[PDB]
Design a protein around this nucleic acid. Structure first.
Lengths: 54, 89, 61
RNA sequence: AGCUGUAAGUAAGCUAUGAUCCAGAGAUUUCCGAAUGGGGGAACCCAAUAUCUUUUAUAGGAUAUUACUUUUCAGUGAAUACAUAGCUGAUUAGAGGUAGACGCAGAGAACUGAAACAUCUUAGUACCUGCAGGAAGAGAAAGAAAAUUCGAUUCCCUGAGUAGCGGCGAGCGAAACGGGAAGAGCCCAAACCAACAAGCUUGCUUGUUGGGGUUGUAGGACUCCGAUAUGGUAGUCUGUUAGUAUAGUUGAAGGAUUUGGAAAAUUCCGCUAAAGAGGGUGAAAGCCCCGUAGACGAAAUGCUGACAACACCUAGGAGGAUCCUGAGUACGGCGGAACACGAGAAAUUCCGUCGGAAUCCGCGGGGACCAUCCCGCAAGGCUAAAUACUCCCUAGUGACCGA
RNA sequence: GUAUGAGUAGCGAAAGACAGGUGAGAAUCCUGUCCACCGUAUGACUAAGGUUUCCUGGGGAAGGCUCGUCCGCCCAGGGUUAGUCGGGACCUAAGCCGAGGCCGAUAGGCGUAGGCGAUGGACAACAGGUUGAUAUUCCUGUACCAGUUGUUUUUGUUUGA
RNA sequence: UGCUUUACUCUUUAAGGACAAGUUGUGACGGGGAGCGAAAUAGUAGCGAAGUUCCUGACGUCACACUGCCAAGAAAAGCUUCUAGUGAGAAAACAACUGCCCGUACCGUAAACCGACACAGGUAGUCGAGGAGAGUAUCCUAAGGUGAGCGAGCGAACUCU
């Protein structure tokens, strides 16, 4: 899971508060799936988000 | 380019003693084979093979004026002959 | 020096190149053995070869 | 009219046929280094294919081409036939460095403060990394307002330590109105019509080229009449001139005496000034020298104006049946961030996931929310100047330093 | 920069004596004789490491734990020669870089084919002489390995060459 | 036709094959040597006599050869054959020529390396003699190399050996 091939989704980072507002650092990552798609007719395998599978 | 092969003859105490057996002490520029020196000598003096010998020299210090510097690298060449002489030097 | 060098043909340039290199051999061996009251002829042969090579540079563009 | 650097010293020479020196254009440029034929412990070693060379001949020498990836075009190809991997050849672009500066992003601390310390602050600072440019970023209203309105952005003064946020503690802290600097607006997607190809059932759907078309007072298609002019440019390193940058030329006027080693110092009598700023000379000079004020000057290369040419771009009036106006977008739940705003009564902007609209009788906003009114059309791009910095160049200045 | 400590502590394990030299100057330099020490090492040869300390001729300002005519010190000149020795134009172990490739906020991490890498494998020369310094390197004699040019006795590219 | 392997028949201290330290000639009329010694100012140049027998005798060499044991003891190239193939006619003898790049002086149980020093410390490998002796122990010695980089007096306290 590194990028999207169609959209521009990539992994990132943000805080994490818990019930007395102590902050740490997360790794917020997108849902990604290895999908066989038809790039210029020739099939590849590539990472596509599930958001573009609607 | 074989006139930049040989530079000078060496005139020392052993080099004059090499003259008695048809052996001559030249300074050849760096990165030169034995074969270039044979071809250059045969071009410039009409003599033959009886193979060359080739040395190298590591440099030295000198000091003049609170300064410290090396000298050049060198490369000798002790060329032997078969049949001719060089009363040229 | 320049002008009569610009008067020659093409091959005579190469002939004078060979003659001046042989004079440089002779001035080297006659410097090593303690000779040559003229030592200021060594710049002249070098700069003559230089001027000849620039003249041959210009004529072949 | 003297010259061969520092640097004396010797010995050789050069120049009136104009040296040395200065300025603008050229030529040559060993080997390592992104290093790029292969290798390596940088400045080394070892190759391949052509061509020309030395020797009776192999050995020896010289020149040119040979990395990787991708942009395009050919051949070649095959698990498996059709053709896709792949291979080969040609063609197009990159690859590293600084200026220890200025800009935009990703990721992101601790000591310290709170007289301790957990949310908070230090602080999105220091450090790393990517991406550029001479500037970057932002920029043509889904805006600021509350009328009686104004019309892209940036920067400065003022609003103001005000309204606000905050274990409401330490502390953080705006924006609009007003005055100025500088001023500028353009191009698409769609709906429509042609030229071609395809399942063309010859239904005329899809795809490419060319015309059309760019908005809120809604505008465009489409229809009917006009009409073929007017006017701008944020291009063309194409010309023709004006200027300027890099060598320069010329440039006024004083003598004697005393003390002196030596006078510019002193004492008499003069002269100059579009020049009495400065430096040098055996001590302190308007009149000794270098200069300064003024005046003049460019073969060569670069730069900036100008105005010619050439490129571009730009039409009116009325009608309103039908059609078009940016989609997994707007928006909602959940979890985080950005807004001065720490979930707070929390609008507006993003990010991850899961749900998910309407089409002008429409849609957004005016700090939860509803109704009324007012102001505006998102989900497509481009854009000069006013602004910040100085590695380096030229010319200057300082109640800045004097080992 | 200069004192006090103070002309004090120290002078870094070991056996020297005399005669004759040179010289302005001698226990400390040269020469001669006798004595003494190590002798599985204080004797010989090489691998690292050092980088001209090597040899010849001069010099005595500083260095030498004293002196010094001497020196590994200062000045000037001069010496290291390879078809066969050790390495390259041969091979691979540990390990490292690793076209494509597989992962990963950037940076980058790991890895097939192919490589690089001796402490190992494989490989053709022996004795003597010579100088102030070099010697399986120079010369003396006798060999060996791989080639190239003229001579030497065999033909379909079927191989029967 | 090379290599591997299964069944059957013979064959066996036999035969075939493979390796081998070493010896004898040649090299060699050569150079080596106890000692003599000039022709100038050199023990220099030049001249050389013997080369025997017995005793001890190696983990140096055959050679990891042989027996035994379990902890079960590197790879790739060089080399050798057989075919695939390529495919004028090369292959012995003789003679003459060619064979590239880097290191080579010196010190190297030290005064020249590692310790700030001309320092009682450390430094991998090979050779390592004689009389006694198991021996590389210990004592004295050969070949060789040193006499230590402050001394001269006196012979009290005290400290060390």
């Amino acid at each position: 899971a590194k990028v999207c091939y169609f959209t521009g989704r990539k992994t990132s980072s943000g805080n994490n508060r818990s019930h007395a507002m102590n902050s740490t650092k997360r790794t917020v990552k997108p849902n990604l799936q290895k999908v066989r798609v038809l790039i210029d007719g020739k099939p590849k395998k590539v990472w596509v988000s599930a958001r573009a599978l609607k | 380019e074989l006139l930049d092969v040989i530079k000078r003859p060496v005139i020392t105490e052993k080099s004059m003693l090499a003259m008695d057996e048809k052996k001559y002490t030249f300074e050849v520029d760096t990165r030169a084979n034995k074969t270039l020196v044979k071809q250059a000598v045969e071009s410039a003096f009409d003599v033959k093979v009886a193979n060359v010998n080739i040395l190298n020299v590591r440099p030295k210090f000198k000091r003049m004026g609170k300064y410290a510097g090396y000298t050049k690298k060198r490369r000798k060449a002790i060329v032997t002959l078969t049949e001719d002489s060089k009363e040229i030097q | 020096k320049v002008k009569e060098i610009r008067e020659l043909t093409t091959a005579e340039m190469l002939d004078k190149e060979k003659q001046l290199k042989e004079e440089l051999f002779n001035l080297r061996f006659q410097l090593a053995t303690g000779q040559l009251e003229n030592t200021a002829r060594i710049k002249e042969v070098r700069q003559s070869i230089a001027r000849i090579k620039t003249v041959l540079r210009e004529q072949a563009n």
